[PDB]
From a paper:
Unlike other chromatin remodelers, INO80 preferentially mobilizes hexasomes, which can form during transcription. Here, we report cryogenic-electron microscopy (cryo-EM) structures of endogenously purified S. cerevisiae INO80 bound to a hexasome and a nucleosome. We group subunits of the INO80 complex into four modules: Rvb module (Rvb1/Rvb2), Arp8 module (Arp8/Arp4/Actin/Ies4 and Taf14), Ino80 module (Ino80/Ies2) and Arp5 module (Arp5/Ies6). The Ino80 protein consists of three major regions: the N-terminal domain (NTD), the HSA region (Ino80HSA) and the ATPase domain (Ino80ATPase).
While the INO80 architecture appears similar to that in the INO80-nucleosome structures, a major difference is that it is rotated ~180° on a hexasome compared to a nucleosome. We find that INO80 binds hexasomes and nucleosomes in opposite orientations, with Ino80 binding near SHL-2 on hexasomes and near −6/−7 on nucleosomes. We observe that Ino80ATPase engages the hexasome predominantly near SHL −2. All Ino80ATPase locations on hexasomes are different than on nucleosomes, which are near SHL-6 or SHL-7 (12-14). However, the Ino80 orientation on hexasomes is consistent with structures of other major chromatin remodelers on nucleosomes such as S. cerevisiae ISW1 (25-27), Chd1 (28-30), RSC, Snf2 (34) and in particular the SWR1 complex, which is from the same sub-family as the INO80 complex. In contrast, a gap at SHL-6 did not inhibit INO80’s sliding activity on hexasomes, but a gap at SHL-2 slowed hexasomes sliding by ~ 2000-fold. However, sliding hexasomes is less flanking DNA dependent.
Residue numbers in the entry:
A (entry chain A): 61 to 135
B (entry chain C): 16 to 120
C (entry chain D): 29 to 123
D (entry chain B): 24 to 95
E (entry chain F): 25 to 103
F (entry chain E): 39 to 136
Amino acid sequence: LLIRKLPFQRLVREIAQDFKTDLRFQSSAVMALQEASEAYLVALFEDTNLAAIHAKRVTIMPKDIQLARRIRGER
Amino acid sequence: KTRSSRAGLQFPVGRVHRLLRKGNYAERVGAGAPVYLAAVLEYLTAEILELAGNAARDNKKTRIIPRHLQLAVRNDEELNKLLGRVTIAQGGVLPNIQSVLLPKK
Amino acid sequence: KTRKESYAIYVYKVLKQVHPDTGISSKAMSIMNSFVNDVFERIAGEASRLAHYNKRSTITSREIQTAVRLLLPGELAKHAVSEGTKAVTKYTSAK
Amino acid sequence: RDNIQGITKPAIRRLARRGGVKRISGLIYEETRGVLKVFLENVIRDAVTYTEHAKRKTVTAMDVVYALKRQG
Amino acid sequence: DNIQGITKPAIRRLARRGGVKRISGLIYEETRGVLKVFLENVIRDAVTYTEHAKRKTVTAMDVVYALKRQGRTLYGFGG
Amino acid sequence: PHRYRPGTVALREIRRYQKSTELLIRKLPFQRLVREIAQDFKTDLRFQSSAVMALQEASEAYLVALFEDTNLAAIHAKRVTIMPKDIQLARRIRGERA
DNA sequence: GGGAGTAATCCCCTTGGCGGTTAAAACGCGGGGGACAGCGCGTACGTGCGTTTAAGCGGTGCTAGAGCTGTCTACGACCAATTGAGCGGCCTCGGCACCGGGATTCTCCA
DNA sequence: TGGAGAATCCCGGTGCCGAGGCCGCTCAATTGGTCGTAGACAGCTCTAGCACCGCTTAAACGCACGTACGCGCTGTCCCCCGCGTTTTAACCGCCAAGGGGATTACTCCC
């Protein structure tokens, strides 16, 4: 694991507070959430790496991230 | 008498019940489910026909062509999100020229 | 000739109920029919899987409401939920 | 409140380093927190919907599993 | 081979609908290849559903289900 | 002899082909292409005309979406010309090529 | 007693072809604006060091709420009767594409 | 910078063919009743989740600093566009062979 467990479960509790009050969570639920988020960001950073190497650079810019999410199909 | 008038809709409810029964989605099917589903389909039809009529009035037409449906679905954000992975035959593409390609003289 | 079921007269009723002075072509008829059949299949399949996931054998109004909540984005989902609840309530309260 | 800063600079650095990124700017962080927030907003609402329709007050792991299968 | 029928100005007009100002000459062969791959997958799925459903003639609704298998759904051809 | 500057006719053609809606690839070469591809899988198969029209529509949609993605990738590389590396990048980001 | 094998059929649609012709791709060239290569700088980024903070581990207490059994009752499968909404055949007259003359509007270059 | 000039918009006449009512059936939707059980509800148990606390130690914050490359500028050269000209294949209109999947009848077996 890369992201620490307690900040990520604090974040998922804070974002689930906005949709239903007094919501309780299982521990394997937040572990699966952490694993899915890390897999998403690793795949994203690989795509932005190809975007950065395309434009003759080794430093990644945010415009690489908007290029990756635009070409990938998201908004 | 008929249950579409009883619910207060225009879409059929018995046809929706028969199509839910045929498709084997579950072993049992309730009574309020085709009423709710016909209401949902009628309301989605209400936005798309509203926005298509707005497009046709913009383009000075009285009959809706599929180009006006394409323009209506690709302009509203929620309808473009719901119908993102579809395509409309004889539709065309929204006008979008990127700014850096303009003749900046 | 065989009988083919379409939704053309009902969407023509909806179109004349909203914009009273507007026509429609047969091609646009075909795309609009395809839209309503596809959203029928999508909401129906989502409701079917929610029926299966809770060890339940019946499709009710709750399953269709949850399917509209999952499958439709934005305020369009909330307004469709309101329309469905109003139609179901006046159907049940009818004599 | 303001707990999006828990996704810190070296954690983002390791997430890029597993992906093979060599050099990272300073404006990368303020965009990747936004992308992670958007992804979590799109998952947790489906998890909440599944938990509410089953008439439960606890989000189980299985609800998360079907929530992720929603997006594919 | 009939892949040469997809001519140079046809890909030029496909570029112009997508909003392309300047086109290199090496685009065209790659475009022919990627359209070959896409059509090969689609007709494979269509003949699969037709051979399972047992007719000699492939109908449009079968390739609509083939496109719906790929998540590239089409409206307006009986779908 | 009057001559327009290089670049204006591209703007005119982009506007004219984004405003219109009629199909671009001619019918009979695409018919020959789909028959030749179907020759490889099974033999003596026959097509409806609506099937061929649907394949034309799907090919148009896929290639215009691919060219829009290629154009955005080309602008990101600080150029105007599209190049085959832009197409390869656009297909690698989607995941169509492993 | 009813589903199904076999066959004749009236077609309905598919594929192939043949000549006109005419838009449309193919080609060639002039030439010019962008792709590409190289240099300068200065600015931002990796690395390292010292410190400060909080994550994780253990330990426990309370109690909400998932999970399951018992029972029944209102609700949905299911069947006979019937009947009007919704399908298809068909007639038309208007909506909209097309063509042309002219006004309008960008654009080039001297 | 203003005239040339070509591309675009715009309104009047043309016509054509297709959307939309109208008529007439017919068959699945509606009424009514019957029965069997799915889930609504009650209630019991006791797993798992939330929280309070402390302690140790790895991880991050912060700052200095050297320098690697991002980007702006300039030269070059080349290949791609605009347009004139030449050949060619899509299309069109119709015809003809002819195969093909649904439509009746004739007849058979568990």
